[PDB]
Ligand binder design. Structure first.
Ligand code: ATP
Ligand code: ATP
Ligand code: MG
Ligand code: MG
Lengths: 325, 331
């Protein structure tokens, strides 16, 4: 019965972290929370935060106010793999009803190398960095994620026609990991064609692995297909077994205390958190109680349709997860 | 009579160029196509003569030349080479809902102006040490001003209202920031046009949920690749949307999404709409407006008949049956 590092964050952060705790309790999840505050100090996150996370190795983070701290946390824990599973939600109607895609995004380098130069006045160079090391690393994670989540297909998304040496190396390491993991079927597709096909028939895609900027964009595109950042879970995998699962929506200060928030997204990142450890059944039941709540449509928060308060939403999940085996 | 360079390209290019000729013949278009081919040869002799032919005719229609991305970096995309050599700095596509092609969204009417020579497409890479590769995205003031001037002039001249610059300046502060700043400089001279900006990630999210909010969109090279394909997909796919590539003196017309279609070539199923509409845009550019309009309205009217649709838009008809209906409607 391990414990997690909880980071409620700001604005609506506490509210939804309260909602997630009450639901994990009603499910009797072997999980209690060690609240901790990350804030830029001295530049670093407080020592009491880095210590809990190196101890428990599992974190659940809500929205922070606006050095970027998700940049700070990434470098601090070597968070090299951003993972966003997107599943259409029964009860939350978007024009895309058959989405089940996991974007797997290299999170350390690529177009986000931090290196730009003014070469001469009016002429700027931004460096895209692709290394054999980090590319192999994110490919191995992609294939490992596919196995452990019973995913049939992985697609490398690239522009090696245009960026031959950089995207080509990324591809070449995806190819190598593929030929040692033939139980998962591997293919390659151009970023623009993935984009073209995604908005027509998203059901054709399974697991997508790609370098940093493409993953940055595509994960938001996919989330737009299923309803937005209010409902989308996210997890970041780091070195030495760390993993932080997170909201990716705003802090919503304009409703920050008024008990109208939607906790769905943080909850599904928590479900994702549980699955990462291995408490599958607790994850399955919490997930099911959430999906059934939105499907039922009686307790919809104001961002998902109906005029129900945040705790009436939380309570219904509570009731339904107590009545499920 | 005008002489126009025609580059058939790969995949479905050749077969669709034959149908452009049939349509042009039946319409008695005063245009002669002068054909240049581009092989897969590592030697740039082919791509180099196609450039000289466009420099001479000033106007071209082209299919997509396949790029083999397993070849060494010295073997560069022939499409990019041609774009850059002729300095066709504006890629312009118009994605508009077709009432006869029903998709998940309607009321879409988006003009995308994409910087077409710079950015992520500069072909500058190296390996300092083994396994460490750098690619150099180049953004310049001169080219960003140029593309922003184009987008605002187009917005004003076609009676549009809003220009949205699409960028990643929050992360690429110096490069995308320069591009954004050049848009702002031009915006100051078009006070009748609303100027807004939006990060490329959020833009894709808004396109799949409320694409009606967008009017004119201007952006550097790779973001334009992404937004072009998202918008084309939203209005029914790659078989429908024409693209233009404009420089100061030259102009090359193509299909918006620049696809070879190798896997459907030589099966009489490719959608000819985008190629045909591209050939009309070329006709307008040649000031052969009455021809352009005759062909375009026949092409657009054929779209209202679901019996004419090819499989890419949910139909069963062949290419030649679609061409037959277009030609029957040119009168
Ligand atoms: N979990 C949530 N539940 C309900 N509404 C939310 C939630 N998260 C965000 N919102 C709503 O969406 C917006 C949240 O955006 P937020 O202010 O957090 O940042 P953002 O819009 O992504 O960026 P910025 O801070 O620049 O506006 C608010 O209008 C808020 O009401
Ligand atoms: N004019 C067209 N009519 C019908 N389908 C098209 C047309 N142009 C492009 N497509 C389709 O758009 C997609 C993107 O084109 P692309 O050039 O990657 O095709 P391809 O070379 O056939 O790819 P693959 O060999 O992997 O199927 C393909 O599915 C192609 O079939
Ligand atoms: Mg993103
Ligand atoms: Mg192509």
């Amino acid at each position: 019965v391990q414990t997690v590092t909880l980071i409620p964050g700001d604005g609506i952060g506490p509210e939804i972290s309260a909602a997630v705790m009450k639901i994990f309790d009603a499910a009797k999840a072997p999980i209690q929370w060690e609240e901790r505050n990350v804030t830029a100090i001295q530049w670093m996150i407080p020592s009491e935060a880095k210590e809990s996370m190196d101890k428990n190795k599992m974190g659940l983070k809500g929205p922070l106010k606006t050095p970027s701290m998700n940049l700070l946390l990434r470098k601090t824990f070597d968070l090299y793999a951003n993972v966003r599973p997107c599943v259409s939600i029964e009860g939350y109607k978007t024009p895309y009803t058959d989405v089940n895609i996991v974007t797997i995004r290299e999170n350390t380098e690529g177009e986000y190398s931090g290196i730009e130069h003014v070469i001469v006045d009016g002429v700027v160079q931004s460096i895209k960095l692709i290394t054999e090391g980090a590319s192999k690393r994110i490919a191995e994670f992609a294939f490992e994620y596919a196995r452990n989540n019973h995913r049939s297909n992985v697609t490398a998304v690239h522009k090696a026609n245009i960026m031959r040496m950089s995207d080509g190396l990324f591809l070449q390491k995806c190819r190598e990991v593929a030929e040692s993991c033939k139980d998962i079927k591997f293919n390659e597709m151009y970023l623009d064609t993935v984009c073209l096909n995604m908005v027509q028939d998203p059901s054709q895609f399974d697991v997508l692995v790609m370098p940093n900027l493409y993953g940055d964009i595509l994960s938001d595109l996919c989330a737009g297909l299923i309803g937005g950042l209010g409902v989308t879970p996210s997890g970041n995998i780091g070195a030495n077994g760390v993993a932080i699962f997170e909201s990716v929506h705003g802090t919503a200060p304009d409703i920050a205390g008024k008990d109208m928030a939607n906790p769905t997204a943080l909850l599904l990142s928590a479900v994702m958190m549980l699955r990462h450890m291995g408490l599958f059944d607790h994850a399955a039941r919490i997930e099911a109680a959430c999906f059934a709540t939105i499907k039922d449509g009686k307790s919809l928060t104001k961002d998902l349709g109906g005029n129900a308060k945040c705790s009436d939403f939380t309570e219904e999940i509570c009731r339904r997860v107590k009545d499920l085996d | 009579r005008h002489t126009v360079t025609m580059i058939p390209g790969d995949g479905i290019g050749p077969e669709l160029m034959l149908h452009v000729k049939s349509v042009f013949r039946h319409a008695c278009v005063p245009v002669d196509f002068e054909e240049v081919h581009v092989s897969s040869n590592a030697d740039e002799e082919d791509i180099r003569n196609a450039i000289m032919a466009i420099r001479r005719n000033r106007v071209a229609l082209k299919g997509n030349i396949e790029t083999n991305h397993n070849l060494p970096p010295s073997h560069k995309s022939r499409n990019n080479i041609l774009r850059t050599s002729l300095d066709l700095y504006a890629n312009v596509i118009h994605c508009k809902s077709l009432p006869g092609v029903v998709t998940r969204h309607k009321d879409i009417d988006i003009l995308i102006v994409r910087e077409n020579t710079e950015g992520e497409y500069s072909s500058l890479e190296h390996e300092s040490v083994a396994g460490v590769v750098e690619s150099l995205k180049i953004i310049t003031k001169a080219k960003s001003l140029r593309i922003a001037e184009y987008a605002f002039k187009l917005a004003q001249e076609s009676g549009r209202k809003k220009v949205t610059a699409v960028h990643k300046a929050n992360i690429m502060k110096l490069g995308d920031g320069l591009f954004l700043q050049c848009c702002r400089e031009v915006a100051a001279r078009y006070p009748q046009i609303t100027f807004e900006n939006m990060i490329v990630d959020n833009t894709t999210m808004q396109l799949v949920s409320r694409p009606q909010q967008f009017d004119v969109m201007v952006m550097p090279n790779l973001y334009g690749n992404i937004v072009n394909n998202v918008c084309a997909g939203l209005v029914g796919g790659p078989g429908l949307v024409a693209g233009a590539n404009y420089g100061h003196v030259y102009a090359v017309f193509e299909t918006a999404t620049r696809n070879t279609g190798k896997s459907i070539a030589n099966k009489n199923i490719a959608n000819p709409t985008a190629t045909l509409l591209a050939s009309c845009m070329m006709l307008d550019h040649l000031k052969l407006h009455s021809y352009a309009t005759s062909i375009r309205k026949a092409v657009l009217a054929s779209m209202d008949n679901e019996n004419m649709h090819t499989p890419d838009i949910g139909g069963q008809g062949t290419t030649s049956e679609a061409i037959q209906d277009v030609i029957r409607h040119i009168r």
